[PDB]
Design a protein around this ligand. Structure first.
Ligand SMILES: CC(=O)N[C@H]1[C@H](O[C@@H]2[C@@H](O)[C@H](O)O[C@H](CO)[C@@H]2O)O[C@H](CO[C@]2(C(=O)O)C[C@H](O)[C@@H](NC(C)=O)[C@H]([C@H](O)[C@H](O)CO)O2)[C@@H](O)[C@H]1O[C@@H]1O[C@H](CO)[C@H](O)[C@H](O)[C@H]1O
Ligand SMILES: *[C@@H]1O[C@H](CO)[C@@H](O)[C@H](O)[C@H]1NC(C)=O
Ligand SMILES: *[C@@H]1O[C@H](CO)[C@@H](O)[C@H](O)[C@H]1NC(C)=O
Ligand SMILES: *[C@@H]1O[C@H](CO)[C@@H](O)[C@H](O)[C@H]1NC(C)=O
Ligand SMILES: *[C@@H]1O[C@H](CO)[C@@H](O)[C@H](O)[C@H]1NC(C)=O
Ligand SMILES: *[C@@H]1O[C@H](CO)[C@@H](O)[C@H](O)[C@H]1NC(C)=O
Ligand SMILES: *[C@@H]1O[C@H](CO)[C@@H](O)[C@H](O)[C@H]1NC(C)=O
Lengths: 310, 176, 172, 171, 309, 309
């Protein structure tokens, strides 16, 4: 007689997914949840990028010849390159990595004079390591030494009050001479000490002669607080200080910039553009990113169990 | 499936059903016809879309670099960082694997449930006018033409209209 | 729900059922009446209570200070702590939202289940004396007074007593 | 159980059923007999095996020593390590408790589902030749011998053969 | 004919919750899982609290005037305050936060005399920076000088063995003078050196003159082990050592103490009292706490789907 | 009347488990997911273990008597022991833990001569603090001093270029004398200065007389790069440098080795051998381990709800 039958759809070949009780069960339709497609470029559309190139991120503060174009910059996406260098004269920043992390999210920097004027000493200390218009020095810094060879450097005090609405990034250097004789030539004989003090900071520095270097040190000065420098030689003085602009991201990559694609997740290999919750491209990312997973593929079922016709 | 309809008492799916997820296949004196059911199909699609709305296109979490890929940081703190990241990777990989497997289990059963619901709905419509054959079909014990088949699909079938004919065909003995 | 009873073939709930979660509404010559079913209601409440016993009143483990509000710690360690703590926040935020979503899905299907169980109990109870209309009601094909309605709810209904009367009515 | 068969309308399990997980028990003129069903039993065991394949024999990621048991490291760093480690313990203790509880919930409902599917299978098989007891039994309204009982078990029972006899017994 | 209908209960106004498939689905009843109610106090009922006030935690070990009232404290809940300072004379502790963390869970400190006696030198070194009744010095520390101006400080050795069953905290100081001629005025002429030695610690110190300061260094000495000090000037000697009492929890807060409420979860803004599994009050907590989540509310359904008439 | 009944199996004595809904529900069968069975040994089957024993890991680089047999070794599993020490003469390594962590995964070390030769000085400097058959010194190092008491040590430059495919671990020491007169005796009077320079490293060292110690310092030298030593005394020169072999795992334990059991998860009290996802043995593990949980037991149901007769 007459009859009515109830049923459901199917396809010839569905997609295999995993469940709590079964591996490789076939469903009508599925979708990927793990992103594996990478864009081998830095996507900078709708952003204000800064490609540092030759210049080191920490170099923007002290100003070696390679960072002349970045002494003041405004950015929301800072790109660091492998060839970047912070220094010209031998030496290093103490707490360098934590300072890089602050500068990466700063939004860029603005410079302001600290207003130090000097008397009875020389200010024009230069080096052929930092060559800018023939034998110069760090652009934001001043190399202080005696008026003539072997003369005694006077016990000096310089104070700076932060007049602004935000924290000031204060930078200073300690010069470690090639020898005891050279330290004597530049600053006069005897032991040297550099003391830096604020309401939250307190440190003393002694030069260690033997191999030519300038080591840089830093602090963040609160609004209306005063930083005090006491020194009798081997002191690299700040001429300017830095103030942060707003908000940014910092990326370490050798990938070319592209102004034709929009991205919010960045890594060394380029840009991840996805609406998916997970990614398998890179464990080290910056920005708004899917969580890193070790799996290549995790298919989510978007349909019923596939049961093809016999 | 938990409900025993899809991949259960219903042998297989229909590949010819392209206009929906669930449907009816009738057979009478006029021939054979196939039609999709809207209510059950959309109810399944909406629940799947609900899952997609929870997982796809969501506001990702914020990330910053604590490592240096150009020049290596100190070993002690660098090993702590690496240890912590790998621990997060293990947690998130577990979360991702479990989430998908749990959702896939619920999805399959969800679709199976809707097939069962539609089956039971038709069963109650027909009352004492039809019997289940065990394969997902209902043997109708009265002449049910194309209009009658349509009234079952759109839920306007009145069992009282055909009850007397049906009971005479179902109860084929003498009642005393 | 997965069982298609609550928000399914049963149109809507009853706002006048305050004595329980599930119940019976009868209609006869003596007028209508409503009574709650203890067994199905208690089964549902116990299961929800079980979820609450799991989540509420947990014994948490002790954590101590690792950074400083008054005197800032060394900058590299501080950035690692902040990176860790916020990553912990995202995991727990994820876990909490998933747990609630998952439990809520189960709780709704759970309550839908108990309604179906009760409906099926009555179906097997009434045997050949009743037909289901499709809305959640059973049409009794015999005279069933308030005491008879009591026997169905009480689970003491004897189908043999009314079988002959109801079979006569179902056929003609 | 969500499906209401196991610990539901079926009063209790059978301790004598060693043959399988689900089975049939019949009463007739020739006595009692118990036999297990292969299809349902295998379906339930396959799914529990599936859960075990997910949890047991996993490949894990390698972790190195970041601490020092013999030469105490800087307490500032050590306390961060101890904080992170204790936080990982908290997360995994949560995950483990939730995973097992969720799986146990699903396993019990899964097995209950299989009982129901078998019960429904037999119901549609018997058509108008039997009536439901309410305790998980089917009252057969025709004389059904051991050969007839076997035909129900292996899905070869023809209801048309017994329909006339059954109907007049039900009146 | 007669009929019996089955159904369920409903309310006019249900609660919206979220599931795996739906957002804002209405249920009969729901219960909050995220704690948002904060108590703006440190709940100290049942506890033995110490409010350090003007005294810094590390100051309790050396004894500047601000910490004279905390030289031997005993608590199970240590509360640090914003205005607390560890020192009077300029200088700092090496590994300061490591020492703070050890002290926060110490249960407080008991002090014990190390028993050092001296001859041929001064022990009465005092400064105007630490006024107690005129010029004085750290209460647990001795400032050692030469007998007179520019006199030679003799090479000296002092040893202390730990007679207790638990580790001893040893503190000592290195004095850095304002100038080179200052160092020669208080002590002898020539290079100064301080060596501190135990069975698992050895370190030498040299003072760097030019800026007036005293820096403090420390070690944990195991039971029956000995600390050896060898010095010839610029040395701030310990008079008493510290032994820990038991268990405690350290809190940094601006909230007032209250002995009328009980709590075990603390933060800068007070106490979280809750049986709920999650909280949105503060991501930085101490003690036994519910886990912090970003969400303001996460409602758990405690009822069926609400289908009104 | 004939009837056919459907049912399930059951046991008289079931196993209680936990669900989302219930605590202590009885099921037919269950299996454990949390490992609690520990093996009180370090399982070394299928591996190449190195039990350092009395030798401290850092000692393998410089060579005190305790580390003579481990000057060169090859391993995939390095076991540190509590009784291990790095030095014979008093002194320490700079950034010691960082170096330990690099050596733990090194796969062992191979040694190579740096080809330093000397003239006009003595190279046989020794001490009774390092005895082998009488007074000896660090096997990999050379204690350089003047030809006789109070003689002038000549200003020397010694350079070495890494000729290998992988980085070289360069070690050197600075000798701090017991007194100024001792420094004069060994090296001659005057300021002593040691500088160490590669393309990525630059540091100068001055001795600090009064201590009696030899402090060791280190750098990683890139392929084809050159390290330059400039010194005029107080300098402990390397004779050999190290190269890493491959991959290894570092373990800290007090448990004896066992070549008859196999495992990949190690801890303080032994080896965890399991296929289970969780373990409640030790929160501090190394290698490929089940994840640590604080529960002693979590039973997974492998059977239906148990309803006995
Ligand atoms: C052979 C020669 O002329 N050497 C001079 C050297 O030049 C270096 C090059 O050989 C090398 O290839 O590149 C490096 C760059 O890293 C040098 O250019 O430079 C010596 C140092 O110099 C200056 C400098 O840094 O450029 C000159 C500068 O005016 C001065 N600034 C001051 C004083 O504010 C600095 C400063 O004194 C030091 O940097 C402080 O540490 O030095 C230069 O001295 C060269 O000289 C040789 O020096 C030795 C003594 O060591 C003898 O005096 C030789 O007679 C003399 O040739
Ligand atoms: C199936 O899912 C895919 C994504 O995986 C999507 O592109 C497509 O729209 C879906 N539907 C069909 C009918 O293929
Ligand atoms: C951490 O791992 C990365 C690779 O993911 C590696 O490049 C780096 O050397 C590791 N850091 C340390 C300090 O071992
Ligand atoms: C980390 O976060 C805390 C609290 O938000 C903040 O006070 C501190 O400045 C942060 N630390 C660093 C190193 O940026
Ligand atoms: C970390 O915990 C271990 C015990 O698991 C303990 O021995 C060690 O002292 C702790 N570290 C610190 C810095 O307190
Ligand atoms: C609903 O739940 C709340 C808890 O949020 C509780 O206070 C109240 O008693 C419950 N109401 C009913 C009617 O059960
Ligand atoms: C059930 O599981 C247990 C424990 O894992 C196992 O020993 C046993 O072989 C299994 N089967 C039965 C019937 O007990």
């Amino acid at each position: 007689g007459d009859k009515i039958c109830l049923g459901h759809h199917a396809v010839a070949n569905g997609t295999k997914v995993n469940t709590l009780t079964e591996r490789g069960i076939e469903v009508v339709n599925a979708t990927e949840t793990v992103e594996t497609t990478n864009i081998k470029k830095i996507c900078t559309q709708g952003k204000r990028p800064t490609d540092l190139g030759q210049c080191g991120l920490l170099g923007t503060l002290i100003g070696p010849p390679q960072c002349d174009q970045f002494l003041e910059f405004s950015s929301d996406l800072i790109i660091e390159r492998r060839e970047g260098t912070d220094i010209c004269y031998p030496g290093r920043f103490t707490n360098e990595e934590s300072l890089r992390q602050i500068l990466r999210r700063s939004g860029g920097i603005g410079k302001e004079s600290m207003g130090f004027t000097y008397s009875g000493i020389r200010t024009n200390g230069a080096t052929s390591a930092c060559t800018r218009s023939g034998s110069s020095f760090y652009a934001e810094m001043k190399w202080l030494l005696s008026n003539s060879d072997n003369a005694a450097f006077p016990q000096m005090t310089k104070a700076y009050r932060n007049p602004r609405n935000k924290p000031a990034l204060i930078i200073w250097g300690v010069h470690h001479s090639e020898s005891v004789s050279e330290q004597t030539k530049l600053y006069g004989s005897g032991n040297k000490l550099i003391t830096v003090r604020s309401s939250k900071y307190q440190q003393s520095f002694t030069p260690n002669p033997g191999a030519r270097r300038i080591d840089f040190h830093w602090l963040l000065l609160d609004p209306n607080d005063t930083v005090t420098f006491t020194f009798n030689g081997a002191f690299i003085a700040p001429d300017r200080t830095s103030f942060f602009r707003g908000e940014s991201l910092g990326v370490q990559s050798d990938a070319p910039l592209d102004s034709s694609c929009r991205g919010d997740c960045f890594h060394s290999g380029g840009t991840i553009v996805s609406s998916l919750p997970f990614q398998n491209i890179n464990s080290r990312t910056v920005g708004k990113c899917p969580r890193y997973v070790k799996q290549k593929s995790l298919l989510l079922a978007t349909g019923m169990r596939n049961v093809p016709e016999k | 499936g938990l409900f025993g309809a899809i991949a259960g008492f219903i042998e297989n799916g229909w590949e010819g059903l392209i206009n929906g997820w669930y449907g009816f296949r009738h057979q009478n004196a006029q021939g054979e016809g196939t039609a999709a059911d809207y209510k059950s199909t959309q109810s399944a699609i909406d629940q799947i879309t609900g899952k997609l709305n929870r997982l796809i296109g969501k506001t990702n979490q914020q990330f910053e670099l604590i490592d240096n890929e150009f020049n290596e940081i100190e070993q002690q703190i660098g090993n702590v960082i690496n240890w912590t990241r790998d621990a997060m990777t293990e947690i998130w990989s577990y979360n991702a694997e479990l989430l998908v497997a749990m959702e896939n289990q619920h999805t399959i059963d969800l679709a199976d449930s809707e097939m069962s619901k539609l089956y039971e709905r038709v069963k109650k419509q027909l009352r004492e006018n039809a019997e289940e054959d065990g394969t997902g079909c209902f043997e109708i014990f009265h002449k049910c033409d194309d209009q009658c088949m349509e009234s079952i699909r759109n839920n306007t079938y009145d069992h009282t209209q055909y009850r007397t004919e049906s009971l005479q065909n179902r109860i084929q003995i003498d009642s005393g």
